[PDB]
Write a protein that binds this DNA or RNA. Structure first.
Lengths: 385, 385
DNA sequence: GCAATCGCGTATTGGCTATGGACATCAGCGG
DNA sequence: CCGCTGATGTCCATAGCCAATACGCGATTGC
DNA sequence: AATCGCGTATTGGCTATGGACATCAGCGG
DNA sequence: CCGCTGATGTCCATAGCCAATACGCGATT
């Protein structure tokens, strides 16, 4: 009656990849993967030793799929862009494997996936430097990260364009980002922790900072209450003296980020009245907030699925309203850009800003915020052609 | 058995004053006052036309009590500060009568109460100008408001000092505030509504602004969902497509103000490391937030009793932590001041900033924020002598 | 092309609390 | 001591208001 | 001079899931 | 009809989230 397909491992791996993409590593039970393949958990143990081994196999398979879709001597970015775009469109879902799921692996696998990502970014940087021969290494790295984040932003949503419109949009955005002239010399800053200790002036602030750091480093389901308490110097019952629960801490982080973004948007709107100056002010405020609180940005990017329904819905609605304001300004500045193209460009720019803000070594230069804002504005305005 | 004291209306008025001070005018029923006076509700109608007449009588009685406590040619502030301080210490619980309960009266009674308050402030300004005869009208008005707000702050909490320490503290604070040299000139601002309209970029923002304005103008129990919907341009039931309930708007306003204050405090802490500059930066951030959002300040001052328990508790705890940071800085700068004196001075400065921020005609000058910050710092630092 | 959403006026609806009429009782006074 | 007209308490009910949630009606958008 | 909540460190559950013996087919000779 | 490969039954171990109880405070009425 029941037959062994002799390819059980491939089916189990495919189901695990799908479930990890959809719901996450901790929220997907082994029996869920087994049922998706019409087996039980002990069959998976017959095929894989551990659940973590299954996750590592899934992440490696996703990276191999991206590499195969990518399909030697470095060539100008204009020559390689079409291939890069095709690969990106085909692999849009799998971004979370390396970006979020890989967070849960052991040190060796994390180092391996980090090496793969760094090699990809280095190839993109080589292409960018071949496109513009006269560029400082920091500027070349920034433009390479801009191109990479623009290509990777497709995995943060489900929007698309009919026909070859999406490819044209991505090509224009990447080429405009790459060919942006430098705005400052970008000198390395002398190289903080004292300011970080000073800004934790209460037990509530210390617990909030410890929770945000632990959520960014490990993940919400993987952080104990005792870990947050130790970060604050107490036990978990101390955290429950200060908070109602850990979901309360997550909701507090999300609400704090939302309110800060709203305040910066209000200030930017009140400061300027013309379209260009207003868009520049909004981009500058977003960059400022992203650079000042990388942990909040990382939490909002990753752990949003574990927050309360009302908090998540409100945060998403407010972000959508601010993005709609951005799209209206973009459409005013560039009449050719439509609304779908506008939101695609806005998502790409936001992804670039957030990705650069989280990386530490990219933000160790004087006046890097101006460069980030200029690159984001170039990406947003690339719709002109 | 039952006895009619023939002075029943005086006891009814006393109980009404006590209940109006303790809790809101809308939060006490006529049955509560009647029970406190040992009578039934219609017995009150035998002595008063309605509840609004009783409220007006209570407010007039409180103002008359303050006037009697105070008791010609104006005298220098140093020769009248003893009397004013005594009057304030005696009338501290009565202040809310002409500050919150006044909004529920008729137009004529509101104008009469405003006239009484303005006459008191004008007498204070005359005393201040007699003390320092080298001040422009704007500076004299600002210093008079500083003194009046210091006394009103003393009439805002339950803190006190043993013996004549409180009188000495208030005298020093008022004299330091009055004797502050002008920080800068105050040219009248050329005279927006355009900035008040574009910042409402979504239905949620419009509803929030309308709710805040209505709560400030009338009070939380006196505003129904119909007015908020009309301010947003929709029907009353349409408000629930964006909010869970009417209390959700108040909770959102309180949370927004708390997060904005927290962000400004964090920025001020990170900007400066020395004690004096750090305290100046904290005061400047508080002044900036108070001046930019007067409606939020008014809501937090008045309608806080109608918010959720958790939201109110969190807001109070965060404000207490920030004020504790202020008190630590004050104690570092001035070794003489103790913790309780620091609490009193911080309350005085905060009340001064909030009172000046809410008044519209006082803020129509160029660089008034610097003068407000200077006066607040003069109040806070006072205590060296 | 058509069904699933989506705002948006209206329409109820279950408290809830100022008022209020009918009736009742103390107050001191004038024989 | 005792009626005897003021003034001053109760007892129970009613009317209007005000969250908050039902409908139905249109217009739009994914399939 | 009692009297008090205020933190603080264990303490004890209740509940999910990951992993695992024992039995179990199937699938090529 | 047989020896290897895969599967299915329950089952237990153990971690993690909230309460609950314990003494000291150090300030409060």
């Amino acid at each position: 009656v029941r037959r062994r397909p002799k390819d059980r491992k491939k089916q189990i791996l495919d189901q695990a990849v799908g479930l990890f993409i959809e719901r996450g590593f901790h929220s997907v039970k082994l029996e869920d993967i087994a049922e998706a393949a019409g087996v039980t958990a002990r069959a998976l143990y017959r095929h894989y030793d551990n659940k973590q081994a299954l996750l590592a196999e899934a992440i490696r398979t996703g990276q191999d799929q991206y590499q195969s879709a990518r399909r030697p001597t470095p060539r100008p970015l204009n020559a390689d862009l079409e291939d890069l775009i095709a690969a990106a469109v085909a692999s849009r879902a799998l971004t979370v494997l390396w970006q979020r799921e890989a967070r849960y692996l052991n040190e060796d696998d994390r180092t391996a996936v980090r090496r793969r990502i760094n090699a990809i970014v280095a190839g993109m940087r080589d292409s960018v430097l071949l496109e513009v021969p006269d560029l400082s290494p920091q500027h070349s790295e920034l433009r390479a990260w801009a191109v990479s984040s623009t290509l990777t932003s497709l995995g943060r949503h489900s929007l698309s364009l009919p026909g070859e419109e999406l490819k044209k949009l991505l090509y224009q955005a990447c080429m405009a980002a790459a060919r942006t002239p430098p705005v400052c010399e970008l000198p390395p800053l002398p190289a903080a922790a004292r300011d970080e200790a000073d800004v934790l002036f209460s037990r509530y602030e210390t617990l909030l900072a410890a929770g945000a750091r632990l959520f960014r480093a490990q993940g919400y389901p993987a952080v104990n209450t005792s870990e947050i308490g130790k970060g604050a110097g107490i036990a978990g019952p101390g955290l429950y003296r200060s908070f109602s629960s850990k979901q309360a801490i997550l909701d507090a982080l999300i609400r704090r980020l939302d309110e800060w973004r709203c305040l910066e948007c209000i200030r930017a709107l009140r400061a300027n009245q013309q379209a260009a100056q207003r868009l520049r002010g909004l981009v500058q405020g977003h960059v400022r907030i992203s650079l000042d609180a990388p942990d909040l940005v990382a939490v909002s990017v990753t752990e949003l699925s574990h927050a309360s329904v009302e908090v998540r819905d409100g945060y998403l609605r407010n972000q959508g309203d601010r993005e709609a304001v951005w799209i209206d300004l973009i459409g005013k500045l560039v009449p050719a850009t439509s609304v779908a193209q506008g939101r695609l460009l806005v998502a790409a720019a936001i992804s670039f800003i957030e990705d650069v803000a989280r990386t530490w070594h990219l933000t160790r230069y004087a006046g890097v915020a101006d460069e980030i804002s200029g690159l984001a504005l170039a990406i947003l305005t690339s719709g002109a052609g």
